[PDB]
Amino acid sequence: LSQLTPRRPYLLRAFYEWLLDNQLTPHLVVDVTLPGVQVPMEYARDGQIVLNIAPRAVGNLELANDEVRFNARFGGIPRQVSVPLAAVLAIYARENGAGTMFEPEAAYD
């Protein structure tokens, strides 16, 4: 039914936990073109950015259903990041690319 909430946030947390449990470094691939995205555009290229969300690279991390939020340092300068789930394209480990490209969601289209 079209009324069910999107699965993406749940898959994101699942892969995040799985990657960390395999001692890998989870990274998010984000579409900075979508409404609501708040990232240091200086680090974005061709409408995309890759963010390291492993514990040592972020602070105050929240993997909520509506958005991913955290603080991180870009070139030494601490910045607040906020990304709607619709803009999170995939999650992969830096070391070997293990992870997934999320399935499209009617709720995000």
Partner: peptide, 18 residues
């Protein structure tokens, strides 16, 4: 640690998938 710069993440294994 610091967030990856563009020249850095573009060299990561998974960027080819994107």
């Amino acid at each position: 640690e610091a967030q990856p710069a563009p020249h850095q993440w573009q060299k990561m294994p998974f960027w080819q998938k994107v």
